[PDB]
């Protein structure tokens, strides 16, 4: 099932207060008028770049991880005894999580206890950036079960955990004992222009890439655009494929022998060879790894295999370590 | 991870035991006048002529495949001679360093796998062979090694400075607050000059300071008392002289 997202999923992007101002920001937001998957047993969901969650006290806690098999650390949020518990232990998980899930609690590297949260929907946003797992949420009244409310409401932040675990998949948790329902959307690095009112709450927002009118609203840093002609961006057709054209030359470069030469000249009489008109496979040179010092100046060492030079002079000698 | 402490870097610095104390984006001696959200302390042992590679923008085996510092690192790298403690008679071969990896580490990445590095096409069935190298090699620390090769313990303190609440602050004693006077303030590492007044901006419980259009803070939350102070620049203006001649 799919639902429409409309103008929900906006969160305070920088936690610094602003007032009566239109602020343009680049961050992970849920693009407007996008389709969000509606689930109504629980599936395994991809996490990608962040998740928007909505639900309408049946649904408690969430599970995040990469493999979900006690081989890697997995974020667990549970609402028990009115004190919410967050842990990152290598629990061994069940096929369908519902207390069993918290067994084999070893290699624990983070534990946190916080105060409890959760006709009203409960919106959450989970974002994992540079090791910080940021969780935002708000509760709001509803009297329409057929869809997701139309309107605008900014999601107040709750906490930010320095877990730093590579998260790829997540799952919701049901109360252990025809079911409940939730909506999940996926966040994208879109640019948003947010209106801060006198009190400091976001009352409106415009997606800078959703529509040409929204592009003007973003470029003009205004929510009303008077009649006229406006330029917002630039059309440039992107390349379709890469093509490489090189001479038919198949000669191999002397490099092989030069490194492997048995008798080397003395440092005072360093040997110089001029090398041109030959293909040179630096990947064999690299994967022949027995070197103790490899430092290149004025070129990147990792990208010597993608250029073309007029000629290479090879000097060689033997010296002491220091 | 260290946080919620009064980090007294002034005591730590003035000890002559440390052989390398290099800070980037922060001067090594002013650190005691700033407050930090969270400080990461990394520790390890390397050889002497490799400490030079524990710096931003550097290259080499340890920088590329063991410990990579970001281009815009803001913090300190500390190192000192461990030759007496870590090096044992007959050579200390217990400390290992990785030479091979499929790609270079991203900044602060950790890779502790021990799988054999396949450098060629032939698959490695779990035992080293041709084009199949063990990814680690041990340091040959010996008491007779030249200083350049003697071991060095290294601790890298990383400081984060985001728009977030500060917790680790240098131990500068707190003082009383004066309102309606032109003062030079320092609120948990935010410095400036201005007049402090009451404000009616209802910050939400999670916000610490408010910003103006320009590159200036307009309001701040004082610690200990959580009160909201508006900061308005002290009155100034040009002076003109009227003279008949």
């Amino acid at each position, epitope marked *: 099932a799919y639902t429409n997202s409309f103008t929900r999923g906006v969160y305070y992007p920088d936690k610094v207060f602003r007032s009566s101002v239109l602020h343009s920001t680049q961050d992970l937001f849920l693009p407007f008028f996008s389709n969000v998957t509606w689930f109504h047993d629980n599936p395994v969901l991809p996490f990608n770049d962040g998740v928007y969650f909505a639900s309408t006290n049946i649904i408690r806690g969430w599970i995040f991880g990469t493999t979900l098999d006690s081989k890697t650390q997995s974020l667990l949020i549970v609402n028990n005894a009115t004190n919410v518990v967050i842990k990152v232990c290598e629990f061994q998980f069940c096929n369908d999580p519902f207390f069993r899930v918290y067994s084999s609690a070893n290699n624990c590297t983070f534990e946190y206890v916080s105060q409890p949260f959760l006709k009203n929907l409960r919106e959450f946003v989970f974002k994992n950036i540079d090791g910080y797992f940021k969780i935002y949420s708000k509760h709001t009244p509803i009297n329409l079960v057929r869809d997701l409310p139309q309107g605008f409401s900014a999601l107040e932040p709750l906490v930010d955990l320095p877990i730093g675990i590579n998260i790829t998949r997540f799952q919701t948790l049901l109360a252990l004992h025809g079911a409940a329902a939730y909506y999940v959307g996926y966040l994208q690095p879109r640019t948003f222009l947010l209106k801060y009112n006198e009190n400091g709450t976001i009352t409106d927002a415009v997606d800078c890439a959703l529509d040409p009118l929204s592009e003007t609203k973003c470029t003009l840093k205004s929510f009303t655009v008077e009649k006229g002609i406006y330029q917002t961006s630039n059309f440039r057709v992107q390349p379709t494929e890469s093509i490489v054209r090189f001479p038919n030359i198949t000669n191999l470069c002397p490099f092989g022998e030069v490194f492997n030469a048995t008798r080397f000249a003395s440092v005072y009489a360093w040997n110089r060879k001029r090398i041109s008109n030959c293909v040179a496979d630096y990947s064999v040179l690299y994967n022949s790894a*027995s070197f103790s010092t490899f430092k290149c100046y004025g070129v990147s060492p990792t990208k010597l295999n993608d250029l073309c030079f007029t000629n290479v002079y090879a000097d060689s000698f033997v010296i002491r370590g220091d | 991870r260290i946080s919620n402490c009064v980090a007294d870097y002034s005591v730590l610095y003035n000890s002559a035991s440390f052989s390398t104390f290099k800070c980037y984006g922060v001067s090594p001696t002013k650190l005691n006048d700033l407050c930090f959200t969270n400080v990461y302390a990394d520790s390890f042992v390397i050889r002497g002529d490799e400490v030079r590679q524990i710096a931003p923008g550097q290259t080499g085996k340890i920088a590329d495949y063991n410990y990579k510092l970001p281009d815009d690192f803001t913090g300190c790298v500390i190192a000192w001679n461990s030759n007496n403690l870590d090096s044992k008679v007959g050579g200390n*071969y217990n400390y290992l360093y990785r030479l091979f990896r499929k790609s270079n580490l991203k900044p602060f990445e950790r890779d502790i796998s*021990t799988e054999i590095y396949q450098a060629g096409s032939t698959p*490695c069935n*779990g*035992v080293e*062979g*041709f084009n199949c190298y063990f990814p680690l*090699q041990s340091y040959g620390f010996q008491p007779t090694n030249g200083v350049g090769y003697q071991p060095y313990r290294v601790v890298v303190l990383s400081f984060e400075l985001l728009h977030a609440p500060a917790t680790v602050c240098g131990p500068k004693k707190s003082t009383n607050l004066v309102k309606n006077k032109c003062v030079n303030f320092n609120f948990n590492g935010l410095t400036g000059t201005g007049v402090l007044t009451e404000s009616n901006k209802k910050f939400l419980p999670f916000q610490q300071f408010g910003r103006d259009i320009a590159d200036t803070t307009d309001a701040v939350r004082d610690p200990q008392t959580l009160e909201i102070l508006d900061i308005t620049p002290c009155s100034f203006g040009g002076v003109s002289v009227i003279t008949p001649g």
Partner: antibody
Amino acid sequence: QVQLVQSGAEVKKPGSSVKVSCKASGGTFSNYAISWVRQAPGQGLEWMGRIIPILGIANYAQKFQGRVTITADKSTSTAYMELSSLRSEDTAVYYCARGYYEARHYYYYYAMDVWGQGTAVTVS
Amino acid sequence: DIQMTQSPSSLSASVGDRVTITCRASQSISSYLSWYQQKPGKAPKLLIYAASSLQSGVPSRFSGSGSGTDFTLTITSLQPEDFATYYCQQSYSTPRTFGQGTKVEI
């Protein structure tokens, strides 16, 4: 010169387990692996696997995997070989040998330069 | 599994004889060859590594040569203590299979 001294011969019934030891003398496991080699009566040499004590890494030949375990103590430089589910075909001489694994020793190509005296294990 | 063949399977020789033993792999394995001499009731002794390098502590009467797949060990002056078994070993991939051996009798 680093030498390997192995435990004495052992006679054990089929189905039991055997524990062979290998001690370094005049040296330590200074960046060296401990390999195990098998030799049936009147037969040649059979390579089974090797252990890197430094990391506790153990590798074994497919043939034996499952009932064979090699462990090592780096502090005392003593390795021990524990074999279970003994069958009559397990009667043989077992040798421990110093080998290489570090890239820096690429010119040795994982050769073994010092060998223990061997331990005969008879299953009957 | 790399198929490795020794030759000859056995030989008889007297003190002073010139001995040449060949070892061929079923496919190219570069220089991943080690040579061992073994006496009855004793462990083998490493003689030649890297196909051509002379091992420390080995008498200079032993020498190694060969290229590609076929490599040979030569004994210039057979001695009373040289009556023993000679093994070549490949280390290209796991397992590091050993040959059936070559028995040298007087």
